[PDB]
Design a binder for this molecule. Sequence first.
Ligand code: CLA
Ligand code: CLA
Ligand code: CLA
Ligand code: CLA
Ligand code: CLA
Ligand code: CLA
Ligand code: CLA
Ligand code: BCR
Ligand code: SF4
Ligand code: SF4
Lengths: 75, 80, 733, 40, 161, 81, 30, 33, 75, 60
Amino acid sequence: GQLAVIFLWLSGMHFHGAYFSNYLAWLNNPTSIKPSAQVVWPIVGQEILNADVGGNFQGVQITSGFFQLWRAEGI
Amino acid sequence: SHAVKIYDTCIGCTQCVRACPTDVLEMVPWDGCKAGQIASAPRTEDCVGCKRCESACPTDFLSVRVYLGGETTRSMGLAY
Amino acid sequence: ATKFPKFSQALAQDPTTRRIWFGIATAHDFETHDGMTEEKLYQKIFASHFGHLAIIFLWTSGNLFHVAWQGNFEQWVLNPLKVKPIAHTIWDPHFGEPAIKAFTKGGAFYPVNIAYSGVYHWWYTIGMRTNNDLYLGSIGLIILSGLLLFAGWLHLQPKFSPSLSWFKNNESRLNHHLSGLFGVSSLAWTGHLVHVAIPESRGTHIGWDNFLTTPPHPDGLAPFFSGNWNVYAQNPDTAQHIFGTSQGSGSAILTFLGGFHPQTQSLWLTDMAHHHLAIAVIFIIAGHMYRTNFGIGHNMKEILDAHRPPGGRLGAGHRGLFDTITNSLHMQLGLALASLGVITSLTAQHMYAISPYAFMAKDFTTQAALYTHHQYIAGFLMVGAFAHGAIFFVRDYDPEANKNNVLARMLEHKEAIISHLSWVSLFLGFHTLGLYIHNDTVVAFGQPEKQILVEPVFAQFIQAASGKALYGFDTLLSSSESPATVAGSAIWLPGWLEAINSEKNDLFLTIGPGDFLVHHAIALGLHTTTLILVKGALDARGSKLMPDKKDFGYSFPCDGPGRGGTCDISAWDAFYLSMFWMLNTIGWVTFYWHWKHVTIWQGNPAQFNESSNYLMGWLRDYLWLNSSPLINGYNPYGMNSLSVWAWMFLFGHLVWATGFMFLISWRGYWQELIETLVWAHERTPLANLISWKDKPVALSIVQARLVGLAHFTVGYILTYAAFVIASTAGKFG
Amino acid sequence: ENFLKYLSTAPVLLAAWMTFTAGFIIEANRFYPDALTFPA
Amino acid sequence: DVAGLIPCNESPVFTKRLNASVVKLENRVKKYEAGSPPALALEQQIERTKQRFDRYSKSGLLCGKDGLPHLITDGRWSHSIEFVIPGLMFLYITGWIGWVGRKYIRTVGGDTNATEKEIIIDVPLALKIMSTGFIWPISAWQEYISGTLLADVSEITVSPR
Amino acid sequence: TYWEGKAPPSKVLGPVVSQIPSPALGVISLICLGVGTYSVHESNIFHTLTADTINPGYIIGSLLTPVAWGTHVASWIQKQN
Amino acid sequence: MVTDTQVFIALVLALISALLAIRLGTKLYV
Amino acid sequence: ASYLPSILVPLVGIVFPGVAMALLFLYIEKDDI
Amino acid sequence: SIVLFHFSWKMQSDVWGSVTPTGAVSHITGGNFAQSAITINGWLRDFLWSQASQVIQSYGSALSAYGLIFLGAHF
Amino acid sequence: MDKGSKVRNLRKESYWFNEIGTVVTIDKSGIKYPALVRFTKVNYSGTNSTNFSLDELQEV
Ligand code: CLA
Ligand code: CLA
Ligand code: CLA
Ligand code: CLA
Ligand code: CLA
Ligand code: CLA
Ligand code: CLA
Ligand SMILES: CC1=C(/C=C/C(C)=C/C=C/C(C)=C/C=C/C=C(C)/C=C/C=C(C)/C=C/C2=C(C)CCCC2(C)C)C(C)(C)CCC1
Ligand code: SF4
Ligand code: SF4
């Protein structure tokens, strides 16, 4: 069961990278583009948390180093 | 030494005597209970005050009661 | 006998180090001393009170002597706004040369501490001008303390020890301590103000060598006897009066101007004299109320027994309260402590708003120190009052003598009291914290316009009622066409209104949403502390968990892990828990006072009005911002005068943290560790020669909780004192 | 029967009801945002 | 009026706050191409900010010297909209909740498995009870005057009462 | 002096007042209340009080109002029996 | 400006008071 | 004056506490009276 | 907590930073670790008080969530 | 009074003071607390019954 939970967590991380992230823009210019793979619905003014990370994208900057891991894998 | 008192509400089930680690309590013949026995504390100099006897009491409120008092080497749980 | 603590055979026979510790903590509990009777108890209390008075007077004499011998009082009275008062020299061999150079301030020529007690302003106001006067006062106080020590010794002799009936002579004690201790004392103080303080403030030197030939008023008691008392109010000090000099001085000795002296921004000396004369008259009249072997007077037992409403809603009324109060020292001690705490809070609240001392309210650090000091003492006194009330319930209450009594009916419906107090506490806490977090969240998302800012309409209405013509309420003294203002218009209204409507004062500071939220937080704190203390006091005699709690005394560790566990079940534990809440609420109050006054002093009160609506504002604009001059007391680049305060700041933090050590980790772990320590010591060559005489054991549960609380409190007070002093003295605000 | 009885347990029902309350509160704030005070 | 508060309709500081918010949002959006999803989101944020400020101006709130709306809660009817009206709603809703809860407690309490019916809710009965809360004030008053709201003094207590 | 019922014993009024019949106390209380109210109104309500307007008579009259309350309570106590 | 004589007599009166404190405490009698 | 602190501070902070603690230690563990 | 504070301050003051085309090194905190990490007051001032500016001043930006969580964690 | 009869508790120290409990057994063989009573609620110790004397019970 724990392995199932961990695999679900990995699936969620990868899916949020594919659909809700600026991974391609960061790939093109890694130095300037800030990694981010989380987006917040604007409901109470919390959309301010959508930072101006770059790459024509707005979201919460991530610090899990997933972008570097994926680049090392040649995604 | 601590003071251990047994009140007449006791039902003489012996649980307090069994729970006692220092052999302070014992059972004595009695007539005020169905079992015909009541708890007594003849040797409270060996009582440490752990209050296990109170924890192991069925009666609504603790027919056996422990009141902590002057502390000696025995009652202070000291091997030294 | 037979060991250190004579007053406890049980502790004397204890072979462990506990014997020492408890020997210290049971010393003053005279009731529990072996072979103690009521008469000896009362006599020992009497002698102890004599000793305490001697200690107080020696403390005061020391303050006076140090200011006279090492202070710069003369330089200060010359120019009291620019120089800093001196407390005492610093002879510390541990100082380095830069430290000696840094702490040399004020008069200089030696390292010195700048006094923040405000004693300089007080002594200057009461008429002292030279170091000789301070020295004479100190010598007089030393002689008085010696006299009190001798009296304490004397009243322990067999032929001078007062009998037990003497102590319980309530009527005579009240009569004398009202008319004599309070009224005659106030009469003497107003006599001093008329004869010394006022002439000294008007440039005339009155002293022991000439006060018998220079009447305080030119007419000299002729108007007093003839009934023309108005003479003493004529010709007051005009607004263009330089305090301490005859420039623009008057001749009145008893006036009701109100307001503040323009030059000193404090109360008029003549107003204080008239105040104390009236207070003395009232107290002297009040002291003739109870009968003392003179036929006329009231008998208080009859009064108490007679006040039982016929509706029966109070049951037996106050029947039996006289016996309980007179026979119980704890109940009357709690009453006195509570009244003293209320008065200490009142002094803290009134000195800052109504400045009594000349040139104070410009020495900001002294004002902050005094306010914080007296508020903390008030909190301590209130906690002590409730603790001694719990003690009274434990060991002094007699349910048979208070049948259907008002006090018994307090315990009869204790559940309702505790439950409604809990409801009020939860309501206030929930909603105040919710509003604070709401403001924090909306401001965090860059939408400050969504804050729930509640205008304190009621407090502002009260301010307007006193004459605050700023909120546009037009009520009572704020509206000309009102009976109150017209009736008072002639006597004191002009000066009082001029003072209140002037924004260069602490009289009725303007308030807004921040004041509203902080006041509700203060209400939460008071209600929660009262809940804890009242629950402890009322459940002191027993609960469903311990229906026979009264049999175990006031302070016992627990009743074992049985039936769910009973940690912190005694009333002493209720006091111990309530001490944390007292500290927290007093901290809230002092934080509120200090931040508001700091913002006002800086000249930008808008900062508080803006940033006090959300907690991040408190954390940033008050703690983070104002601690910069403090934590910079000593840096690798160098050090300055505030280095001592920074060191004390860190010290208070350390003590506060150390308190957690005793409050979190409990005994069993430490006892098991001391077992191994004992083994190690016993099995070491060259150290087996040295053996302890008292067996070393871990601290007891109650002792450990007390020590943890003591560390918590000491660290708390030291760190906050360091902060409040250092920030204010470093930024002059 | 057993599955529905399990769904009737205290934690499941609390989670479902709190999710429902959060949902309708969120929707109300979505359609009428920044509602400090009531419309006239 | 009230405590020296000028209505937010004619508050210069209020308009300055509105302008500051709008201009900072515009500065933020200036770094995105027109029509980009970030640009659309920022434009929608700007529009929402303008609507919020306009609604506050039109509502009748009172501004302070800081330009932020202040609430009057002394019972003034002209400002009931700020606190009285919502409060009533709360006291209704919670009232409902409370009443409903109490009823459930007193409905499943007359069973041998009363405890077992609290961890496991009887959803049919629970919804039956929950649907009845809209008349909680009337039912509460009827029970109060009928003596079925409060228990008699004959209930659990402590040694000193 | 603890008392139950609906009226306290006369001894609560003290040695002197306890002997005064109810009508006497009632008339005295009315006179005292009238004088005290009149004094309190003449100064500080009908006329502003100044430094040179302090009448001892008005001060005594004002002090007489609590005496009026006490006498009216005592009159009721005497009346009940 | 307190002279050494003033300090000395203050010290003497303090010593007298200290001795009285000693005696009072002794008389409280532990 | 200006000489006393040097004489007294060492006495009050070292000699006085030292002798006081010595006497208290003697009395606490005297084992008689 | 001590380990993480050591790592953070040491890396900010001695490793992390910026370089110029010449090769000059400019660290985040200017190498204040050597002479300020040797006193408790130094840790209190130059590490906690100094580096806590970002959290306390994060309101009104994309990092405001971090300030809110800072307060919530304190609570 | 009798088996199965409800009795209101009067023991001041009892966890079920002023509460109704059902009588399980009564000892007619002397004894100071012969009336065994059982209550619905469990006390802090988890037990739900106790022995009382007939003087400590109000009958109904
Ligand atoms: C006129 C006669 C007289 C006088 C002066 C006193 C005076 C005193 N008695 Mg005595 N007593 C008397 C008659 C008298 N008593 C009689 C007839 C009896 C028999 C029943 C007793 C029985 C008795 C007992 C049994 C005890 C005393 C005690 C005391 C002392 C109380 C503690 C203290 O310092 O007071 C405090 C004095 C004050 C003036 C403070 C007033 C309180 C207010 C709240 C303070 C406010 C002041 C001001 C606004 C603050 C600003 C000042 C600041 C600038 C410095 C005090 C010295 C106690 C004691 O300590 O013994 C030595 C004690 O145990 N008395
Ligand atoms: C496992 C890690 C993980 C985490 C932490 C998240 C977290 C998030 N996702 Mg991602 N996601 C994940 C995995 C994860 N997801 C996976 C594996 C997929 C592939 C399917 C996705 C696909 C996905 C999409 C496509 C989107 C998100 C979105 C979101 C965000 C909003 C979710 C939300 O509240 O919607 C609302 C969710 C609910 C209201 C939950 C339903 C409530 C249920 C009914 C409660 C039932 C509880 C029940 C009573 C318990 C008992 C059991 C019972 C069944 C018997 C949030 C940041 C959204 C987003 O970021 O928008 C910008 C978005 O659009 N996610
Ligand atoms: C004048 C007022 C007054 C009087 C006469 C008493 C008298 C008494 N109290 Mg009460 N009390 C008071 C005020 C008073 N208290 C206040 C204000 C509080 C609130 C804090 C309390 C709270 C209180 C409790 C909770 C209890 C008492 C108890 C007692 C009795 C025993 C006291 C004892 O053994 O001391 C022993 C003395 C000590 C252990 C010394 C401790 C001194 C402090 C805590 C340490 C200070 C450290 C220092 C500041 C550090 C220096 C800092 C530096 C390192 C930088 C005694 C009858 C006890 C009792 O059972 O009475 C029947 C009891 O349980 N009192
Ligand atoms: C910041 C620290 C803190 C806080 C918030 C509290 C809060 C409280 N204390 Mg405690 N207390 C503390 C420290 C604290 N205490 C310490 C250090 C001590 C000394 C040991 C005590 C000693 C103490 C005693 C002895 C008593 C209290 C009481 C209270 C209550 C006061 C009334 C109140 O505010 O109700 C409002 C409640 C709160 C503000 C608590 C926070 C509620 C939050 C906002 C709700 C969050 C819900 C949320 C959905 C959680 C989701 C979790 C999920 C994600 C897993 C409340 C529960 C009194 C009490 O019980 O009154 C009834 C009481 O008798 N406290
Ligand atoms: C429906 C159940 C119910 C009812 C009618 C009440 C009613 C009351 N409570 Mg109690 N309370 C409850 C549940 C309930 N409470 C629960 C679950 C808790 C644990 C968190 C508490 C904890 C509590 C404390 C600590 C205090 C009260 C107090 C009070 C009184 C004042 C209102 C208040 O403070 O609410 C406060 C309510 C809470 C703190 C939490 C309520 C949580 C939810 C909303 C209630 C449960 C609803 C539940 C889902 C019912 C579902 C029904 C469904 C199955 C059909 C009032 C008599 C106070 C008092 O004594 O006043 C005199 C007081 O001090 N309550
Ligand atoms: C207001 C302060 C105060 C007062 C009035 C008392 C009063 C009393 N205490 Mg308590 N006590 C206090 C504070 C106080 N104590 C503190 C802070 C503690 C520590 C927590 C204790 C701990 C304590 C214990 C353990 C005991 C008492 C006892 C006593 C009684 C008599 C003790 C005595 O004087 O014997 C005689 C003592 C002396 C004569 C010594 C006097 C000290 C002199 C004046 C010092 C002078 C030195 C000088 C400064 C040197 C400078 C030299 C320089 C040039 C270098 C008496 C009831 C005893 C008692 O009666 O219990 C029932 C007892 O057993 N007390
Ligand atoms: C409680 C009042 C009080 C306090 C806190 C102080 C505090 C201080 N005095 Mg001062 N002093 C006082 C009263 C006081 N004094 C009085 C009344 C006199 C007149 C004799 C003096 C005369 C005096 C001189 C001449 C000198 C000091 C010095 C000092 C400092 C070093 C301590 C020392 O060497 O003591 C020396 C003090 C004495 C030998 C006399 C004893 C002081 C009082 C009377 C003792 C009070 C005891 C108190 C009631 C508590 C007793 C309990 C205790 C044993 C635990 C220190 C700042 C020295 C200094 O300035 O260094 C920079 C210094 O040279 N003091
Ligand atoms: C534990 C206990 C105790 C204690 C208790 C306590 C501690 C209490 C407290 C209490 C308190 C602490 C109270 C308080 C009070 C206060 C008050 C009562 C106030 C009042 C005021 C008034 C009434 C008014 C005023 C005014 C006027 C004149 C008019 C206008 C407005 C003003 C405000 C200005 C004892 C010992 C008894 C014993 C038993 C138990
Ligand atoms: S455990 Fe209690 S009831 Fe059983 S024998 Fe011991 S005292 Fe009696
Ligand atoms: S407290 Fe412990 S040692 Fe003492 S009698 Fe009870 S069980 Fe025995």
